[PDB]
Design a protein around this ligand. Structure first.
Ligand SMILES: [Mg+2]
Ligand SMILES: [Mg+2]
Ligand SMILES: [Mg+2]
Ligand SMILES: [Mg+2]
Ligand SMILES: [Mg+2]
Lengths: 296, 296, 296, 296
């Protein structure tokens, strides 16, 4: 199977005066490329996919594809939906614009059955010829892709090569790789990046890397080289920022941190996302003081 | 405040060959009107709003408006989104197509903070001049509208008159009406329709009423007339069907039941929703046997 | 079946210099009698049963029996254990001292299966000829007595006549009384006393009644007389204190309130229970000011 | 600090005709010793501590102590209680009978606050001069020892040297060792033995080791030597049995398996524990066939 693994970043989407800051966006992707990141995920959860128009999604994927040309960095485009017809369309659309693969979140809100999830992802995978990474985040979607469903999809569909887990469930991570060791388990939870990698996970799709790409990149490559002592050291040092970045719902803290670091001009979200409380603003600013934040 | 209360039905959306069966939709609405229902909710969760196009939503809302003409039955249109710009747009469109009010689900997947939810709903309420009913369903959205946020919205925005609760949390129902007894609490959980009504709730937005509109209508109207003994008797008799209608994710069981009863022509969903398991199909058929299902 | 129902109080156990203050205990029970309580529950959860010696349990049960003599107030003695051999002994012990019935908590910590729960309570019920009330509080025990297990025990064993539910699950309360309407469902959760009673529950075993026995007894008797408007009114008025009494784990707040009210001499617990934080001490004190606390 | 780490077994307690089978108990401990186990835990959760008398607990600790003399194997005696005075007594008794340390479970059922847990464990630790291992299992106790409380006790009390974690929470395991890397984090959850060990955990207190002590011991010692590929390989191979051993509440499956393997004579529990379902009995028997079970 064709795969996209390694250190990867769920890119924030900066807004300026209500619109996508296209210049900032490209500049941020170049900063990730320059700090050892292996792939970028435009228009994921961290990129506020829910509040972007279809045209803004196209724009962000196109900027990511264009910025990564001539480098080793791959573009794993977010292209999920809780409607199978729309998710299939978004997958073909990401391929048509040159994405190397797609990240496709499990359907939110309508809670499909395991059978329904299987048919959902089989339709997506059969619609394109580029790698597809499943994305399990039950706290956001209201549903869980079972281990059996993931493994069935991995074995039945060529393009489906792994899953990005954001479930706080290391037992499930053991279950997955003990029964299907060929899949690419990807950490979707920065605080437990090292435990997932040390169990055989092959990458991360990180929030923290927006702010500290060199550290997340070093962590991942130490771990993939079985330098677990060095990987664990970085994971431990990052625990405090990894947690504070979820003091409020992601991406509210990471965008606050990027703004505090001078990496984006405006602390703008699209409703229903908004600025954090005055405490969490102060707590994020205080935790950042302990880390070396790369500039441009 | 202008309100929409009483016995209400979250209408299923029947499909035939992948298309909305418009004749069937109108005939099912007529059936609801003739069995004492006070309002119909087109394109809610039970109506598979997630997989309908904007034009199909317009279509279902318009059929609901047209079928209720010349009766007392109101149209409380589903018109929510996890993107505030879209939720405001959907509310304005629901008003333009003749809805009497809107039901607006709490943003799913992106988990806004309480501050974000307040701003979300304040934008929606200010966009139209028809009643707005909040909708709290944390098992599906991944977020909760706190009691404090609900009360603030009720008090600060003229159009917001209550909340549909699907949270399995009678403590919260006490909290709401003990601190703001002027709001309209609406049951969004059929099995506990009577406990919510007996605490001062003023209506239901029901799944079971799709199949048993006369029983759900009688229950609600008994409760509103303070005949609690008769309301509880129907609530108790309906428990088995109320629960089996959630053996699988709503609306999979209710559509299965409508098909088994001959009220819809084909057991069709839009992916990622699909037919129930053979075992759950049999269980639904078994529970139905104890109830008298009105025809057309 | 012989039953013990109505408004009941899970009595706090006052300590003085590390021992049970037997006069205070007696003084507290007559105060409950004088304010309309129908039964008292010595040595329950609220009475710190876990840290009392066997002899101490005997003293509190005997004081309860003697103080209630010649009044209509009954003694429903706490007599549970997570070891069946011991639970049987405590039930016999409780009967020998003149208790009218026993409250028997579901086995904590060792998580018996439903089959094990059945055999546990069948052994207890067969050991005495006085009524047995089951007690389901899964947040504390780690196990749940299923509806089916409760109903089977009710139907198979003479002395088992109902269940005290502290599970925040009004759905289960509907489930219980819809399938076995002859059982005595007892609210073990003060905030939702009225919803449980309004569904056919026949009593409460209350924490709040320690402080406000007149209000809890009036609430219960209003509801049993089908004056739901007046029962709901007291339930609504009591919500703030009903919630603050669990700001920390019961009985830490209620004993704090009893001490603040001058109803007990010193705020003493047995470890691992201890005084609340200074912040919750103040919170409790502030909520109490809105209520009229009967004296002795 | 004095520590007890490595591969450890939460010993089952065999019954024959309702009494502790003392000869079987000694023989099972010798089997653990001969298969590379570094310490045995008499009368823990897996040993049915809840239903043993004070006499039987002393008998089991004494058999463990006597059987381990002249070997390197330590005795980490279960000696916890939800009453601090009793937990202090049991700790004192464990030491007097020659235990090398004690395992002390967080108070069950009575739900102490974090302040209360601190005072509870400080009283225990100050009562003896042997190592004390905390034990967090919130699914069974209804309370959680927070990371902050664990670290405070580790730093404030000499003999408190770590925690056995049964919480399904790899995030917390990262939190613990990142802020206090000197403590001994012990896996109390067999399925995730390897992830905990690979993050710096230093031992296991295992259920599966009752049946497969050689495999658990090899896993642990591979991991302590950073032979992670070999440790993970055993962890993966053991996943199926690790999970099936909790098909029903531990120790029902493990005793069933020990009986099925011919390692104990009689499948006897003390109520409220009981035999597993017929179906689970078969599922355990099926899964056992894939593993080589050492004899005596
Ligand atoms: Mg790589
Ligand atoms: Mg599995
Ligand atoms: Mg409140
Ligand atoms: Mg020794
Ligand atoms: Mg070695």
């Amino acid at each position: 199977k064709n795969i996209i693994i390694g250190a990867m970043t769920a890119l924030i989407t900066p807004f300026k005066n209500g619109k996508v800051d296209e210049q900032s966006y490209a500049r941020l992707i170049k900063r990730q490329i320059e700090n050892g990141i292996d792939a970028v995920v435009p228009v994921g959860t961290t990129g506020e996919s829910a509040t972007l128009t279809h045209e803004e999604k196209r724009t962000c994927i196109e900027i990511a594809v264009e910025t990564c040309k001539g480098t080793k960095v791959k573009v794993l485009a977010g292209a999920g939906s809780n409607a199978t017809h729309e998710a299939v369309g978004l997958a073909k659309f990401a391929k048509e614009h040159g994405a190397d693969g797609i990240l496709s979140v499990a359907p939110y809100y309508n809670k499909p059955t395991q059978q329904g999830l299987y048919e959902h992802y089989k339709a997506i995978a059969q619609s394109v010829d580029i790698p597809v990474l499943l994305y399990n985040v039950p706290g956001r979607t209201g549903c869980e892709i079972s281990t059996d469903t993931i493994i069935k999809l991995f074995r039945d569909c060529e393009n489906i090569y792994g899953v990005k887990e954001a479930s706080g469930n290391i037992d499930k991570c053991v279950d997955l790789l003990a029964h299907e060791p060929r899949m690419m388990l990807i950490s979707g939870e920065d605080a437990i990046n090292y435990p997932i990698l040390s169990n055989g996970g092959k990458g991360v799709i990180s929030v923290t890397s927006n702010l500290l790409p060199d550290m997340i990149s070093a962590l991942t490559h130490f771990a993939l080289d079985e330098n677990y002592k060095e990987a664990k050291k970085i994971n431990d040092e990052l625990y405090n920022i990894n947690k504070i970045l979820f003091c409020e719902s992601n991406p509210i803290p990471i965008k606050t941190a990027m703004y505090l670091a001078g990496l984006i001009e405006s602390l703008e979200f699209r409703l229903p996302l908004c600025s954090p409380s005055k405490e969490n603003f102060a707590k994020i600013e205080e935790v950042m003081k302990k880390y070396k934040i790369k500039g441009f």
